[PDB]
Amino acid sequence: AYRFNGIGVTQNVLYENQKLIANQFNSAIGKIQDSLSSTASALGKLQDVVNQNAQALNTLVKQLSSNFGAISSVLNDILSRLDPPEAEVQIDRLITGRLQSLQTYVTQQLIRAAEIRASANLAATKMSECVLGQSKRVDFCGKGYHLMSFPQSAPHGVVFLHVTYVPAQEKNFTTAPAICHDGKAHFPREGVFVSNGTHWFVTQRNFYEPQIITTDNTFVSGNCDVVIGIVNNTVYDPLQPE
Amino acid sequence: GVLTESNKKFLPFQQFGRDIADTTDAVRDPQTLEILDITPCSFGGVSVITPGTNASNQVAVLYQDVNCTEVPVAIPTWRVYSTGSNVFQTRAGCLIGAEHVNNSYECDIPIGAGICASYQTQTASQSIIAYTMSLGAENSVAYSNNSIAIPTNFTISVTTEILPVSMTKTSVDCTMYICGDSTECSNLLLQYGSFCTQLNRALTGIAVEQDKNTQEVFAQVKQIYKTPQIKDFGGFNFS
Amino acid sequence: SVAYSNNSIAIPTNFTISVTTEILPVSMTKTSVDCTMYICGDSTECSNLLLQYGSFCTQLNRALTGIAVEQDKNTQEVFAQVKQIYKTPQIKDFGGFNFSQILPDPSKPSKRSFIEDLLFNKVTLIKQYGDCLGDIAARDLICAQKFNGLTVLPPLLTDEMIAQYTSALLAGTITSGWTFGAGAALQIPFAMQMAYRFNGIGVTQNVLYENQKLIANQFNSAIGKIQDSLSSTASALGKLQDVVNQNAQALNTLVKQLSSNFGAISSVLNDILSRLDPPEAEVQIDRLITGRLQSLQTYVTQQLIRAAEIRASANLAATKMSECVLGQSKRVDFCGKGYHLMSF
Ligand SMILES: *[C@@H]1O[C@H](CO)[C@@H](O)[C@H](O)[C@H]1NC(C)=O
Ligand SMILES: *[C@@H]1O[C@H](CO)[C@@H](O)[C@H](O)[C@H]1NC(C)=O
Ligand SMILES: *[C@@H]1O[C@H](CO)[C@@H](O)[C@H](O)[C@H]1NC(C)=O
Ligand SMILES: *[C@@H]1O[C@H](CO)[C@@H](O)[C@H](O)[C@H]1NC(C)=O
Ligand SMILES: *[C@@H]1O[C@H](CO)[C@@H](O)[C@H](O)[C@H]1NC(C)=O
Ligand SMILES: *[C@@H]1O[C@H](CO)[C@@H](O)[C@H](O)[C@H]1NC(C)=O
Ligand SMILES: *[C@@H]1O[C@H](CO)[C@@H](O)[C@H](O)[C@H]1NC(C)=O
Ligand SMILES: *[C@@H]1O[C@H](CO)[C@@H](O)[C@H](O)[C@H]1NC(C)=O
Ligand SMILES: *[C@@H]1O[C@H](CO)[C@@H](O)[C@H](O)[C@H]1NC(C)=O
């Protein structure tokens, strides 16, 4: 109920339809479990990271098979075939080449570490906001209006379950900005004046909860000429009859 | 290279000229006092579009900066992949080996400049087709100046977001990787030991950063709460 | 200084509608490098000693392809947030607001807006073998760098589809408010949407309805003012021009590096091969090969750094588009100075 009040829907609608909400939540959880069980190509990022690291190590190993202008790529052969003072040239060439390879590998590792650090910071702030609280930012914790968040641990990463609110099928209604009862403009406190065929009601923004127009739902202000689209109707007074 | 007529005229004491790349582009013929220009014979990029070799062996070739008419000027199997009957000029060079299709679907292999290539059953024969990209379903909103739409129902939805947290920590032994059980070597590495120390310091910094990331992401709260025994959550099943 | 007492308060009596411009880079030019062409330059004597460094060549090509696919991912993520494409309404009747400048004009190619036309004209951004062969007098750098295996790949999504996505987003946010961000779009009169925004920034909705004409006039005047300022002040799109100039300078200096001999007797392979026997020429060839490989590696590393910075900026732009455009943000200064109302 607190979450529903947070996303701008009155808390009573949750208590009116609790069983449906529980059934929908359970069905959605089962559906995503089945999707994870079936669709294998879902955890692309973690596999990409581990494959990238393995490929970097494998190519670093493979670099040893190239002679950087020397006569051979193995120190034992050079040392067996040549005297020290002249073989030192080939040894120096190989040393320079392998140092360059190591430096390149280290630099690429630094780049990847910086990118992973950025991703980790994003994950940390997402955990702080969406999981430990309710976020009013749009699309930060999933499409729709955010309600809850359940974290799960995955190797070299994290997966979030963003439980969200999505409005279903709608209807077409005729609306007016204000209502002129008796020479006085009236404006809705929280909702919008919606009119069906031959009646006027007031409803909340994100749900259809028709209500009769009373002095407790509207506040008076101004006159009946300034507003562009004012219409005539009647306002119920819940004190005069008594 | 390829020789051609040149408008430039050298000074009497000059023989050949050099460009910004410091290579010989213009020369003066010794037999006939004439100026000629030299240009490389290779110019242009080629890319090979293909589905998995597990699927099929057919390929489509994209020439980046060559019109299909001038393909013979640019360049058995290669000639077949250069002949016509399937040419299709695009905004990023002409494409040979694929069939144009009017319909638009989601992209599979991005050719570039709004063209995508994919494997489809153009009848159960298979052929590589090229089509324009599909942005999405067209739609319009019935907008008036006194009309509003209001939802009457709600649907609870759950989604998954996956983010990397850390990578594998590694360390490198420079002397072992370079020389290897060699007393003759590892004696000339005393000069580059400083570079070795620099690499080791960088790798240790990366590793401690990874540990810090792993700690920071999941250890936000300190007090550890035991799960309750009785669920009685009003209907929600957190099994 | 502020006249501060302990029982005194100041309260505004009027409001002014203001609009600002925020420019962020999204993507950089994609490049690919043919290492063998750049090093050996079509010599069969060379390209036989590059079999040892083919691994380095493959590494560079892999890194550059990764950068290119990252660029495509960035430009897709920034603008393709919403999927359903909404057609702009025919009748405007928006209560006074005139969105003519930003709404697309179908009387021109690519159906791009007036502001988009001016922005495209502000930033000063295909070739052929015959064109490069014939045009010798004008030493254009594009042909020279293309003769050395340096090619520029086009983006997957061109400007027309970007304009289409922008028009769809604008039409959705105008005819449906922010409800089209989550679920299906719901039509709402623009006055009601503006009242919703005013209620969001803590100002009672009635003050909007009492002062609609003044607000519409202020909005139109502000739009015209920024249009004139952008048409006059040229030094406004500094970041995008800086990005393209940086990429062009990097390519130009990579081309220029070919004129230095890394300790060899000469900087051209043809001269060394014509003056020396193979066994003693291989030393100079190896020196030049090592130098040019170092140059290519340096260029690749700098490109990686720039790509990382651009990715960070693109992520910021994507979240800004998600928050300020598809909704109303209560964070201060995130969507401009003042209290945020709209975003186009
Ligand atoms: C409008 O709502 C009132 C409320 O009772 C109802 O009596 C009336 O039939 C409705 N009009 C139409 C056209 O359904
Ligand atoms: C717009 O609304 C006004 C009243 O607010 C109405 O008089 C007018 O007819 C409406 N526009 C159209 C095209 O009907
Ligand atoms: C509303 O009522 C006033 C006074 O009774 C009248 O002048 C006005 O014309 C009415 N409006 C409509 C739309 O009938
Ligand atoms: C050089 O010899 C060629 C062939 O014998 C001849 O065509 C040419 O005219 C000669 N050049 C001069 C300057 O006589
Ligand atoms: C193609 O790939 C599938 C899935 O990886 C595999 O089962 C199949 O055996 C492959 N084809 C061949 C000819 O091996
Ligand atoms: C070459 O291709 C371009 C692509 O825009 C086209 O405009 C031009 O007419 C073509 N020229 C020839 C000779 O094919
Ligand atoms: C699509 O365009 C091509 C080229 O004009 C044409 O041959 C084909 O018939 C078109 N397809 C349809 C379904 O109109
Ligand atoms: C709302 O949706 C649920 C499930 O789709 C359905 O059982 C319920 O009847 C719907 N509400 C109304 C008022 O039809
Ligand atoms: C508020 O500012 C507008 C435009 O500057 C002006 O027309 C209006 O009179 C001002 N309000 C008051 C109460 O002076």
Numbering used by the authors:
A (entry chain A): 899 to 1140
B (entry chain A): 550 to 624, 631 to 678, 684 to 799
C (entry chain B): 700 to 824, 830 to 1048
Quote the original article:
In this study, we systematically investigated BANAL-52 and BANAL-103, which exhibit the closest genetic proximity to SARS-CoV-2, focusing on their spike structures and functional characteristics. The cell entry of coronavirus into host cells is a critical determinant of their infectivity and cross-species transmission, which is mainly mediated by the conformational change of the spike protein involving receptor recognition and membrane fusion. Second, Cryo-EM structural analyses revealed that BANAL-52 S is stabilized in a “locked” state through linoleic acid (LA) binding and an additional N370 glycan, whereas BANAL-103 S adopts a “closed” conformation due to a unique glycan network. In contrast, both exhibit more compact S1 conformation compared to the SARS-CoV-2 S in activated conformation and ACE2-bound conformation.
Cryo-EM data were collected for both BANAL-52 and BANAL-103 S ectodomains, yielding density maps at a resolution of 3.51 Å for BANAL-52 S and 3.11 Å for BANAL-103 S. The final structural model for BANAL-52 S encompasses all residues from 14 to 1,140 (excluding residues 71–74, 183, 251–253, 625–630, 679–683, and 825–829) as well as glycans N-linked to 18 sites. The entire structure of BANAL-52 S aligns well with the SARS-CoV-2 locked conformation S, with an RMSD of 1.116 Å. The S protein of BANAL-52 contains an additional N370 glycosylation site compared to SARS-CoV-2 S, which, together with N165 and N234 glycosylation sites, forms a triangular glycan pocket that stabilizes the conformation of RBD. Correlating these findings with their receptor-binding capabilities, we speculate that the extra N-glycosylation sites forming a compact glycan pocket maintain BANAL-103 S in a closed conformation, whereas BANAL-52 S is stabilized in a locked conformation due to the additional binding of LA to the RBD, resulting in even lower S-receptor binding. Based on the structural analysis of BANAL S proteins, Y365 in rotamer I would accommodate LA binding, while Y365/361 in rotamer II would cause a significant clash with LA. To further confirm the importance of Y365 in LA binding and S conformational change, a Y365H mutation was introduced into BANAL-52 S to disrupt the hydrophobic LA binding pocket. There was a marked increase in hACE2 or Rp-bACE2 binding for BANAL-52 S bearing the Y365H mutation, and the Y365H mutant S-packaged pseudovirus exhibited efficient cell entry compared to wild-type BANAL-52 S in both hACE2- and Rp-bACE2-expressing HEK293T cells.
